[PDB]
Design a binder for this molecule. Structure first.
Ligand SMILES: Cc1cc2nc3c(=O)[nH]c(=O)nc-3n(C[C@H](O)[C@H](O)[C@H](O)COP(=O)(O)O)c2cc1C
Ligand SMILES: Cc1cc2nc3c(=O)[nH]c(=O)nc-3n(C[C@H](O)[C@H](O)[C@H](O)COP(=O)(O)O)c2cc1C
Lengths: 211, 212
C-alpha cells in the first residue's frame, strides 16, 4: 500500500525488557494506527540473517566484477552475496526507515553496522562523482535510541557515536530528513526512569502522527 | 613474558590483499625486532569467535547475577558467556593494544564493535561514579592502524571519519593515557599514488615501532 516503512531494530530483548524497544513499539504501533494502508516491515536484526562482510563476500564480489555470473560463485558465496543483495534491494525499495537501538559503549550493537554495510551499495544508495552523491533523495528516516546517561546536552554529547554515525550515513545516502528520538538518563537518574520512559513514549506517539 | 601486546586485526583478507594488514605487519614485525622479549599476541577477529551480545548472553548474565553457577547455564549461554569473559580478561591483562582495520562506510567492520563490546566491562576497564565514569586502564597505551580509500585527515571528509573517532572515544572512556593513529589513506582516490602511499605508511610504521 501507499508507503513502505522499514522498522529496523537492533536489540536481542523485546519491548517488555528494553527502553528502546518499548519506545519504538509505541512509535510504530501508533504509526500503523495513523497510516493503516502503509506496509510496515519489522526488520529484526537479531533474528534475521545479516551477513558480515567476509572472505566469501569479497570473493563473490570479485567474481561478479570480473564478468562472471552469479552461477559461477560457490555455494557459500551465493548464499552470502545473495542475501546482501536482498537486503540492499529491500532498503532502496522502502520509503521510510526507522532505526531502533540501545547505546552500547557510545554506539549501537555490531549487527547495526552489518546492516549498514549490507545496504550501502554503489548504484543503489549512492553513486561516485568526478566525491559521491546520495540517491535516496526522497526517503525519510528516524532513529530511536536509548541510553543510560544524557548525550543530547553537556560534555557527554561529544561522546555520542550511534546517532552520529547514522547521521553520517543518511547524509552519505542523500536522505534529507533524519530525525532522532532519545530515551536518555534512566541509568544516571534511576528515580526518574519511569518518568523519562513515559515522556519518550508520549513523544514517540506524537511523532508517529506526522512521520 | 615482558610486555604483553595485543595485535588486534579486523580483516577477512591478509597482508597481501590489504593496505591495513600490510602496514600493520610492518609495524608489528618491527616491534618484535625492537622488543624480542615482548609477548605479541595476534587477535584475529575473523578467526576467533567474538560473540555479539545477544538473547543468550543477557540470559546467561542474568542467571549469574541471580546466583546460578556457570555450570547451570545452558550450553549456548555458557559458550557465549565464557567466550566474552575470556576476551575481557585477556584485554585487561595486556599492556598495549594495536588495532588494525579497513574503513568500511566511514568506520570499521562489525566485528570490531563486537570486540569492543566484549572488553568494555565495569570493574575491569572502567568504573561507574556518581559523577559519570572513570577509566581503569591508566597504565595502558594503544595505536590504531587504519586504511581508507579516500583522505580523512583533512578537510571536509574529516567530519565523516568515524572509525578512529570511535576508538578514541573508547580509549578515553577506558582512561588509556595514550592512543595514536597511523593512516594509510588516499589509495583509491588517487590510484596513481597507491604504491607511494603504501610505502610511506610502511616507513612510518617501522619508525613508530621503535617507541610504542
Ligand atoms: C553492553 C552495554 C553497554 C552500554 N553502554 C552504555 C554507554 O556507553 N553509555 C550509556 O549511557 N549507557 C550504556 N549502557 C546502558 C544502556 O544504554 C541503557 O540501559 C539503555 O536503556 C539501553 O537500552 P535498552 O534499554 O533499550 O536496552 C550500556 C548497556 C549495556 C548492556
Ligand atoms: C565495504 C567497503 C566499504 C568501504 N567504505 C569506504 C568509505 O566509507 N570510505 C572510503 O574512503 N573508502 C571505503 N572503502 C575502500 C577502503 O577503505 C580501501 O579499499 C582501504 O584500502 C581498505 O583497507 P584494506 O586495504 O586494508 O582492505 C570501502 C571498501 C569496502 C569493501
Amino acid at each position: 500500500h501507499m508507503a513502505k516503512v522499514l522498522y529496523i531494530t537492533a536489540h536481542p530483548l523485546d519491548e517488555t525488557q528494553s527502553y528502546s524497544m518499548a519506545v519504538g513499539k509505541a512509535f510504530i504501533d501508533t504509526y500503523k494506527e495513523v497510516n493503516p494502508n502503509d506496509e510496515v516491515i519489522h526488520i529484526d536484526l537479531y533474528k534475521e540473517n545479516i551477513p558480515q562482510i567476509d572472505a566469501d563476500v569479497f570473493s563473490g564480489w570479485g567474481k561478479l566484477q570480473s564478468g562472471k555470473g552469479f552461477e559461477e560463485l560457490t555455494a557459500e558465496e551465493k548464499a552470502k552475496v545473495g542475501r546482501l543483495a536482498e537486503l540492499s534491494d529491500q532498503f532502496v525499495a522502502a520509503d521510510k526507515y526507522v532505526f531502533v537501538t540501545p547505546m552500547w559503549n557510545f554506539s549501537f550493537p555490531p549487527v547495526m553496522k552489518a546492516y549498514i554495510d549490507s545496504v550501502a551499495v554503489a548504484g543503489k544508495t549512492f553513486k561516485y562523482t568526478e566525491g559521491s552523491v546520495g540517491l535516496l533523495t526522497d526517503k525519510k528516516a528516524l532513529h530511536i535510541q536509548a541510553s543510560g546517561g544524557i548525550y543530547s546536552e553537556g560534555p557527554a554529547a561529544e561522546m555520542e557515536m550511534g546517532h552520529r554515525y547514522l547521521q553520517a550515513i543518511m547524509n552519505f545516502f542523500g536522505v534529507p530528513s533524519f530525525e532522532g528520538l532519545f530515551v536518555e538518563g534512566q541509568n544516571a537518574m534511576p528515580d526518574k526512569a519511569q518518568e523519562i520512559k513515559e515522556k519518550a513514549i508520549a513523544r514517540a506517539k506524537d511523532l508517529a502522527h506526522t512521520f
